[PDB]
Amino acid sequence: QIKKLLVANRGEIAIRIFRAAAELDISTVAIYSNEDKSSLHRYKADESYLVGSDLGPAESYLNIERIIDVAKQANVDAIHPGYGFLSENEQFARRCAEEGIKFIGPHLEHLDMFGDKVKARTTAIKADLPVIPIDNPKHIEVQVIGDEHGNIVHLFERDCSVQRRHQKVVEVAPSVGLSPTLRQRICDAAIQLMENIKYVNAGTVEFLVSGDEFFFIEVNPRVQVEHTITEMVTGIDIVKTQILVAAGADLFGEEINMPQQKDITTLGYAIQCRITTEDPLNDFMPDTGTIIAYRSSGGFGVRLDAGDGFQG
Amino acid sequence: AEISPYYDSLLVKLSTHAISFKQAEEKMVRSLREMRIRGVKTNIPFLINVMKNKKFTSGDYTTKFIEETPELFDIQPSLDRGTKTLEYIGNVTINGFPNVEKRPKPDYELASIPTVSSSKIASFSGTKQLLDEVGPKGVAEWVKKQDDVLLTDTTFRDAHQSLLATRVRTKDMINIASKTADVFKDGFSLEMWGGTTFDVAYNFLKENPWERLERLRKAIPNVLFQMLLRASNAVGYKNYPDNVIHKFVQESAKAGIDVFRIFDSLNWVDQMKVANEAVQEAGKISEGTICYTGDILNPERSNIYTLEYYVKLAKELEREGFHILAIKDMAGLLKPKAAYELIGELKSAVDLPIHLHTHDTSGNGLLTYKQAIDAGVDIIDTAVASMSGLTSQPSANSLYYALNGFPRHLRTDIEGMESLSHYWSTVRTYYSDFESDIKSPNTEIYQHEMPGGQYSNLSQQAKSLGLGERFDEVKDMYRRVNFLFGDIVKVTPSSKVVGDMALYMVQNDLDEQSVITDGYKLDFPESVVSFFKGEIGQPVNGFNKDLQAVILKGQEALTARPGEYLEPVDFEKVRELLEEEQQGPVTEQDIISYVLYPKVYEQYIQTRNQYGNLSLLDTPTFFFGMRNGETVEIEIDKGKRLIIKLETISEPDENGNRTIYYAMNGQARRI
Amino acid sequence: GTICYTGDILNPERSNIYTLEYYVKLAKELEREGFHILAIKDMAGLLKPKAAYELIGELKSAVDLPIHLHTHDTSGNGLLTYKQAIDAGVDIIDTAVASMSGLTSQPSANSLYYALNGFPRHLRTDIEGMESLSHYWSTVRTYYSDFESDIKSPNTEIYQHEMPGGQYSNLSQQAKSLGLGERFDEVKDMYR
Amino acid sequence: FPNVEKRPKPDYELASIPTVSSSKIASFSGTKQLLDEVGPKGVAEWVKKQDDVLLTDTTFRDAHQSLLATRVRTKDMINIASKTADVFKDGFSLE
Amino acid sequence: YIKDENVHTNANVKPKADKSNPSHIGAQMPGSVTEVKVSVGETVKANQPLLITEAMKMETTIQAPFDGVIKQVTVNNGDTIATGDLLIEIE
Ligand SMILES: *C(=O)CCCC[C@@H]1SC[C@@H]2NC(=O)N[C@@H]21
Ligand SMILES: [Mn+2]
Ligand SMILES: [Mn+2]
């Protein structure tokens, strides 16, 4: 029941959303800032508007009131937050629904319940999940999607163990080395929590594996960067489904074509790498400059959800 | 890529994959939609419809799927608009623009463009709504009741026709439409069409004047739209049959014109009937115009254009059923006391509201207005300060304050007017190439009576011959030719006639007496013979029989009005021609625009074919193109803008072709 | 003895100081000083048409001195002002040749000559003569094109800020040099 | 030249400067002669009696102070001085 | 990118200033750069001379609008400039 959609984000994720929405024959709307006057995501949508002509290029994307002003003045009835901006912001979703605009994601109390570090732990105790101490840990997180009709499924785990300090580096889907029934006990424990609090839309349950035991860490209440990796092995499109849940569609319906719980299986393996502007010569720090030459790949198996690097 | 006919041509192999067949097909369509290959005709639109066809999405299809599908073949060229724009900007950046001094794109100041929301303007109920509720007669009855002086702004028409060679583009008008709607919410009308605009828009600016009309209509729904309409030919350049005048008035009224100021270049009432009747039929406002000449204050100036002449003329036009009497002082000859005495007399004489229009070329315009207002004038034509004065109309801004302490006030918003002035003060800067050379008040107009522009146009022309020195004699000859022609009203084209003789006579060294003596072998200018042929109507005094004979050289002069002699235009033929020339379906606006300006219209369609809709470019870019490293935005809808960056221009290759390195919508392109 | 005109005697709300009777008192004071002529210098062209009629009307009742009126045409109402002052019995006015008149300059003598046609008082000068002078200066002005003023339109905002002569142009040039070019409305306002 | 847009010496329209013989000027008796005859108090009394509006031309001073940054030179003023003398023969004063 | 060793000297095309950005100082008139008084990264007070330009045998002194640090100096001594060319950036 969605006519047109706005993306409250920028870069690769926005372009991914526009492609998903245009596939659902839904008109697309994009916003940009002072420094993103020539970002790729500005052009890949049907409609593009400047947000905060006076506010800075960093703050511009995190202005709750002004993004609503654009959506209102454009007949936008649905906003996709993307990730890592207002995606985990509670008052953005409240404000969206107040203006009659569907927030694509979990409900108000879900972000409230998983936003705080303490509350996103009180829920896990209420749903039987461990916490208090660790050595030789294996970072695994499970993808979870649930609709507005009470049907919630999992899309297996991700092996997010290859990481530096406060930064993920390489993901793997599905996880390697872990016994068939170990990953079962992780995924089942992930559903244990999400079916318990009636979770809606896309979401992630972060676990820490040591030896042979589950441990709840946190919940990411949106799409993550490493989402693509899972889609390729499962076959199911995450971003697409997100929009479809916002319309009020059933999971195993004719519109999503989601397979049943024992019908969803992984095909082969998948690996993701993020192409930033970081390097061990400047110790993983970005640089400014025109991208003189851009050489991209493609082909079989290689999946490209691009957005930032091009002509120059 | 260089594509050769020697191999199996294959550009891209596109493959989609999803959990369902439905989704895989939708991804394919999306991908093909995202594909854009220009330069050579591909196969994408066929592939699009193949996937789009419902008989495919269900599955269960045969090898005769293509054979058994009629709707699979479709005529859709996909008009590459962006390339066409890149080419225009490319051309003007390299080779320049007509009558614009080839220089780097000049520095301009930021024009802060004040705005009023459309929902606020939709709440307004001005004179447009009045006409819709009470009719043309009801409007006139209402104007008569108002104590305040109502105004008509000319910024969108006669102001820039006088000051900037009619070169002001739709874009600059559209940008302040919503503010103008608010500022002039209480104005009588906005003159924004007619005069030279129709012709100039199509020919010089290469933009559709009907779109100007239609786009201003939407943006300003509250105020009456006014245009100037010449009685003989509406907006054209020659003579036309009656059905041509009627078709134009029908179309203009539909398009949004509400007040038609109908004038005749010789004050000949007979030539005003056809336009009048057309406007009456359209249910719109018909302003019967008296053009002003001579000097009613000086009884030694004319035994013809006296005060009672204008009263009888007013009384006549009222009997003709005109809703409003308009005084068009085309050369700015209505001296202050004359204004007072004239309007004062006409108010007793007729029961129509008087709508006064003058030029400030003598520098006594505001005084004339002030004086007219004392005499009880109903409406006056003004301009925004920055587009006012000299050959334009008096400044509305000046007048507003001029009346402080006097009985009658100017009904308007000064804050708004000041704001508009500042806007137009910056915009005018874009048009400096078309600035008139007149920069101070000239009172010699009281002798020679050269209207509107002329005095400059006829100065260049006097130089373009060998008379550039002895312009003293031209100014004199002009005044003598007027009296030689029996003292006539001088506006277009009657003004060109007198002009052309002044040159001619001075050139060939002609007397008043020797124009008859040598006339048998003289060969007078085409506009002159035309005048004595009655091809622009009958003068008040008529024609000197001898002069007419000497000029016509055997030819017969028309007895009735020029329009009667003319074969009615078969508008079907016109449709049949223009549909052959163009893609297909053609509008009534096209048809009537062709009839009025065949060649000009044809050339416009040629430019439209080449460069697309130029009216959307901003004026500086329109006139100058782009400098290196510049980024230009072109607004189409809300969040539908073309982003064009110019990187470099190469050196000319073997064929003199320069390669232009662009970046449009993030995509790199070469023109 | 010159009185500089400021404020707006038409507007009781404008100033409590520059009243009609402030000008009467000043003129009478200058008379006793033994100035031969009383002059009204309107440096910012603020003397509105009706105000001119009022001021000269009263000052001629106040003093026996001839009144010599000097205005600028920056508002665009200069000629109207002069006309009105003539109606109120002004003795001498400051005009300029047409091609050197208008805007920040004096009102046009050429224009004023014809403006008064049909009215009771007539300007003592030579029009045919002044048309010739006007043509001359029109050419000379060409030599001085590098020093032309910024002003090409009348400006009524002068009634709010009251900047004399070319200041509202000069101070804008100044505002640009200080980086306040996009905020000149703030400057004009602050000036007031 | 300082503040002069550096272009080659332009072709101008020739002004054929109107002149009035200095002999004709010597016979004129305007307001300069009035001052010599009746003095400043008298000149003021004379202006009172005059019904016509008298004018002061500001072309030589304030007009160009306003329009041309006070740049108008003497050579241009002196060229029409004789003509100006004749045109304004009945004017109150020249500023 | 190749730096052209002094062959053009002045024929360097400067960017155009953002007229809405109060950090951008643009050239008011075309001319030459006589003296560059400040460097990139230097703290300046309001009204402090940053540049001295020469238009038509006349020296203009470009000053700081406010207190701030220079972030880019576009020009050098003897450089030619056009109206609207970016000259200085400050915070
Ligand atoms: C010069 O040839 C460059 C092409 C510019 C064409 C434009 S379109 C509008 C103007 N009218 C016209 O005939 N040419 C100009
Ligand atoms: Mn006109
Ligand atoms: Mn002065």
The DSSP annotation for B533-584 comes to: TTTT---SS---HHHHHHHHTTPPPPSS-GGGGSPPP-HHHHHHHHHHHSSS
Q: Which two tokens stand for residue C132?
A: 């010739």
Rounded to whole angstroms, what are the CA distances from D56 to A48, C53, C76, D63, D88?
A: 64, 20, 20, 12, 9
Size of interface B-E (CB pairs under 8 A): 14
Distance CA B406, CA B566 (A): 53
Give D32's DSSP letter: H
For residues C111 and C93, give the distance between their C-alpha atoms in angstroms, rounded to a whole number.
Answer: 14
What DSSP designation does B521 have?
G
* C78, C45 Cβ separation under 8 angstroms: yes
- The three-state secondary structure class of C130 is helix
Pair of tokens at residue B440: 């101070």
Closest listed ligand to the CA of C72: 3
For residue B91, what is the enclosing H or E element? helix B81-95
Burial of B572 (0-12, 13-18, 19+ CB in 10 A): exposed
* Contact of B330 with B451, CB cutoff 8 Å: yes
User: Which is nearest to B533 in space by CA: B490, B493, B487?
Assistant: B493
**Considering only CA atoms, which residue is closest to atom 7 of ligand 1?**
B97
Alpha carbon distance E19, B291 (integer Å): 48
- Check if B628 contacts E (Cβ < 8 Å): yes
The Cα–Cα gap between B33 and B38 comes to: 13
Min distance E57 CA to chain B CA atoms (Å): 22
State how far the Cα of B362 lies from the Cα of C176, in Å rounded to an integer: 36
Ligand 1: residue whose CA is nearest its atom 6? B97
Gaps after which residues in chain E, C–N over 2.5 Å? none
How is residue C69 written in tokens? 């009126």
Q: What is A1-132's CATH number?
A: 3.40.50.20
Asked if residue B290 lies in contact with residue B259, where contact means CB atoms within 8 angstroms, the answer is no
Give backbone dihedrals phi and psi of A119, rounded to 5 degrees, phi first. Answer: -70, -35
Q: How was this structure determined?
A: X-ray
Residues of E in contact with D1 (CB under 8 A): 56-57
Chain E residue whose CA is closest to D7: E56
Q: Which residues of B533-549 are buried (b: 16+ CB within 10 A; e: fewer)?
A: bbbbbbbbeebeeebbb
* Distance from the E7 Cα atom to the nearest Cα atom in chain B, whole angstroms: 19
Nearest ligand to the CA of C4 is 3
The total of other beta-carbon atoms located within 10 Å of residue A124's CB is 22
Residue of C47, C100, C155 to mutate for B, most B C-beta atoms under 10 A: C155
- The residue whose CB lies within 8 Å of the most ligand 1 atoms, and thus the one to mutate among B85, B86, B88, B92, is B92
- What is the whole-number distance in angstroms between the Cα of residue B195 and the centre of ligand 1? 22
Residue ranges of E strands in C45-191: 67-71, 92-95
Place of tokens 């109206």: E83
For the record, the structure tokens of B592 come out as 């009537």
> Are C54 and B405 within 8 A, CB to CB?
yes
Dist. CA A67–CA A92, nearest whole Å: 10
Using CA coordinates, name the residue in chain E closest to B629: E15
The verdict on a CB contact (< 8 Å) between C154 and B385 is yes
Rounded CA-CA distance C41/A256 in Å is 85
8 Å CB contact of C156 and B385: yes
DSSP code of B522? T
What is the phi/psi pair of residue B79, to 5°?
A: -60, 105
CA distance B312 to B521: 41
DSSP readout, C2-22?
EEE--S-TT-TTT-SSS-HHH
Task: Check if the beta carbon of residue A57 is closer than 8 Å to that of residue A38.
Answer: no
Whether residue B106 is preceded by a cis peptide bond, meaning omega within 30 degrees of 0, is no
> How many angstroms away from the CA of E90 is the closest CA of chain D?
30
Is there an interface between C and A (3+ Cβ pairs < 8 A)?
no
Nearest in space to B616 (alpha carbons), one of B184, B170, B315: B170
Catalytic-residue membership of A19: no
Q: What is the Cα–Cα distance from A242 to A106, expressed in whole angstroms? A: 10
Per-residue exposure over D36-50, b if at least 16 CB sit within 10 Å of its own CB, e if not: eeeeeeebbebbeee
Distances, alpha carbon B352 to alpha carbons B156, B287, B355, in Å: 26, 10, 9
Look at E20 and B109 and tell me if their CB atoms are within 8 Å: no
Asked if the C-beta of E28 comes within 8 angstroms of chain C's C-beta atoms, the answer is: yes
CA of D75 to the centre of ligand 3 (A): 23
Q: How far is CA B328 from each of CA B184, B291, B302, rounded to the nearest angstrom?
A: 22, 5, 19
Strand partners for E26: E86
Nearest to B198 by CA among B171, B161, B241: B161
Q: Give the residue from chain E lying closest to C176, CA to CA.
A: E28
DSSP designation for D53: B
| Alpha carbon distance A198, A148 (integer Å) | 9
| Cis peptide bond prior to A259, omega within 30° of 0 | no
3-state DSSP: chain D helix, strand, coil percent, rounded to 5? 45, 5, 45
CB contact under 8 A, E63 and C182: no
User: What does B426-468 look like in DSSP terms, one character per residue?
Assistant: HHGGGGGGG--S--S--TTHHHH---TTTTTHHHHHHHTTT-S
Order of all β-strands in the sheet with B660-664: B631-635, B641-649, B660-664, B667-670
CB atoms within 10 A of CB C9: 24
Number of C-beta neighbours around residue B93 at 10 A:
21
Distance of CA B360 from the midpoint of ligand 2 (Å): 10
* DSSP H stretches of helix in D1-95: 22-26, 31-49, 62-67, 74-79, 81-87
For residues B249-276, b (16+ Cβ closer than 10 Å) or e, as one string? bbbbbebbbbbbbbbbbbbbeebbbbbb
Mutation pick for ligand 1 pocket among B86, B94, B203, B206 (CB with most ligand atoms within 8 Å) = B206
Residue B159 CA: which ligand is closest?
A: 2
Coil vs helix vs strand at B325? strand
Q: Using CA atoms, how far apart are residues A94 and A112, in angstroms rounded to an integer? A: 11
CA A6, CA B623: separation in Å to the nearest integer?
37
Nearest to B527 by CA among B479, B556, B561, B495: B495
Tell me the residue ranges of DSSP E strands in A210-306: 216-220, 270-273
Residues 6+ apart with CB under 8 A from B281: B246, B249, B250
* CA separation, residue A179 to residues A90, A182, A186, A189 (Å): 38, 5, 11, 16
CA distance B260 to B262: 6
With beta carbons under 8 A apart, name residues in chain E contacting C178: 47, 63, 65
Which of A94, A185, A222, A303 is catalytic? The answer is: A222
| Whether the Cβ atoms of residue B634 and residue B617 lie closer than 8 Å to each other | yes
D61 interfacial to chain C (CB closer than 8 Å)? no
Whole-number Å distance between alpha carbons of B143 and B155: 22
Helix (H) / strand (E) element for C33: namely none
Give A186's Cβ-side CA count (13 Å radius).
Answer: 32
Measured in angstroms, how far is the CA atom of residue B330 from the centroid of ligand 2?
5
The neighbour count for residue D16, using CB atoms within 10 Å, is 10
Burial of E1 (0-12, 13-18, 19+ CB in 10 A): exposed
Q: C-alpha B475: how far from its chain's center?
A: 30
Give the bridge partners for A170, in sequence order. Answer: A162, A273
DSSP letter for each residue of E53-70: EESSS-EEEEE-SSSEEE
**How close is the nearest chain B Cα to the Cα of E45, in Å?**
27
Q: How far is the CA of B403 from the centre of ligand 2 (A)?
A: 23
C-beta separation of B187 from B223 below 8 A: yes
Residue entry with tokens 């297996």? A156
> Nearest Cα to A140, choosing from A219, A208, A202?
A208
Yes or no: say if A303 and A9 are a contact pair by the CB < 8 Å rule: no
Contact C56, C69 (CB under 8 A): yes
| Position A275, amino acid | I
Ligand 1 mean position, distance from CA B95 (Å): 9
What is the rounded (10 degree) CA torsion for B420, B424, B427, B433? Answer: 170
> Which of helix, strand or coil describes residue C41?
strand
Say whether B395 sits in a helix, a strand or coil. strand
Sequence-ordered alpha helix ranges (H) in B320-413: 336-349, 365-375, 396-402
Integer Cα distance of B379 and B144 in angstroms:
10
Going by C-alpha positions, the residue among A124, A137, A182 that lies closest to residue A156 is A182
Number of cross-chain residue pairs from A and B with Cβ atoms under 8 Å apart: 53
E84 close to B (CB below 8 A): yes
Q: For B26, which of A23, A235, A311 is closest by C-beta distance? A: A23
What is residue B667's three-state secondary structure? strand
Give the DSSP H or E segment for B629. Answer: none
Q: What is the C-alpha separation between B310 and B331, in angstroms, rounded?
A: 17
Which residue in C has a C-alpha nearest to residue B388's C-alpha? C153
Interchain CB distance below 8 Å, D47 and C64: no
For A70, residues 6+ apart whose C-beta sits below 8 A from its C-beta are A6, A29, A31, A49, A51, A76
Cβ neighbors of B513 (< 8 A, separation 6 or more) are none
- ∠ CA C103-C108-C114, nearest 5°, is 140
Please state, as a whole number, how many other Cβ atoms lie within 10 Å of the Cβ of residue A308.
16
Distance B201 CA to ligand 1 centre (A): 13
User: Residue D68 in 3-state DSSP?
Assistant: coil
Contact C92, D54 (CB under 8 A): yes
Looking at domain B450-556, its CATH architecture is: Orthogonal Bundle (1.10)
Distance of CA B502 to the CA centre of its chain: 29
**Could you give the CA distance from residue A43 to residue B631 in angstroms, rounded to a whole number?**
15
Percentages of chain B per state (helix, strand, coil), in multiples of 5: 45, 10, 45
Beta carbons within 8 Å of B220's beta carbon, 6+ residues apart: B121, B177, B178, B180, B181, B190
Contact C110, C98 (CB under 8 A): yes
Name the nearest CA neighbour of A114 among A126, A102, A104.
A126
Chain length of chain E: 91
Q: Find the DSSP H helices in C77-153.
A: 78-87, 109-115, 127-143
- Residues linked to residue B229 through DSSP beta bridges, in sequence order: B262
| Residue of B267, B202, B264 whose CA lies nearest to B228 | B264
Amino acid at B336: P
SS3 content of chain E, % helix, strand, coil (to 5): 0, 40, 60
Three-state DSSP class for residue D56: strand
Sheet holding E80-81, edge to edge: E59-63, E49-54, E31-36, E80-81
Distance, C-alpha C57 to centroid of its chain: 17
Best mutation target, A23, A53, A257, A292, to test chain B (most B CBs within 10 A): A23
Backbone angles phi, psi at A201, to 5 degrees: 70, -165
Helix/strand/coil for C135: helix
Tell me whether strands A201-209 and A138-146 are parallel, antiparallel or unpaired: antiparallel
- CATH class name, domain A134-312: alpha beta
Contact C100 D54 (CB under 8 A): no
Tokens 């999306």 locate to B30
Q: Say which of E13, E20, E82 has its CB closest to residue B110.
A: E20
Give the number of the ligand closest to the Cα of residue B356.
2
CB atoms under 10 Å from CB of A311, counted, come to 12
Q: Are B294 and B280 in contact (CB under 8 A)?
A: no
Burial class (CB in 10 A: 0-12, 13-18, 19+), A36: buried
Q: Residue for token digits 């400021």?
A: C6
Note whether D touches C: 3 CB pairs or more under 8 A: yes
The conformation of residue A214, written as its DSSP 8-state character, comes to: -
- When computed from its CA atoms, the radius of gyration of chain A, rounded to whole angstroms, is 20
Is A38 near chain B, with CB under 8 Å? yes
Domain coordinates in residue numbering, chain A? 1-132, 134-312
Mark yes or no for CB contact C105/D12 under 8 Å. Answer: no
**For B648, nearest residue in chain E (alpha carbons):** E13
Token duo for residue A248: 């009020």
Kindly state whether E72 is in contact with chain C, defined as any CB-CB distance less than 8 angstroms: no
Would an 8 Å CB–CB cutoff place E49 in contact with chain C? Answer: no
- Please provide the DSSP assignment of A56-124 as one string: -TTTGGG-HHHHHHHHHTTT--EEE--SSSSSS-HHHHHHHHHTT-EESSS-HHHHHHHHSTTHHHHHH
Rounded CA separation B421/B162 (Å)? 17
Q: How many CA atoms lie within 13 A of C130 on its CB side?
A: 32
Q: Does residue E66 belong to the interface with chain C, where contact is any CB pair within 8 Å?
A: yes
DSSP string, B263-286: E-TT--GGGGHHHHHHHHHTT-EE
Report yes or no: E22 at the B interface, CB cutoff 8 Å: no
Number of neighbours of residue A297 by Cβ within 10 angstroms: 6
Question: What whole-number distance in Å separates Cα of residue C134 and Cα of residue C98?
Answer: 5
Tell me whether residues E22 and C182 touch, CB distance under 8 A. yes
Please give the helix or strand (H or E) that residue B324 lies within, else none: strand B324-329
CB C89 within 8 A of CB C182: no
C-alpha A63/C-alpha C72 separation (Å) is: 52
Return d(Cα C53, Cα B400) in angstroms, integer: 18
What CATH fold (topology level) applies to the domain B97-449+557-625? TIM Barrel (3.20.20)
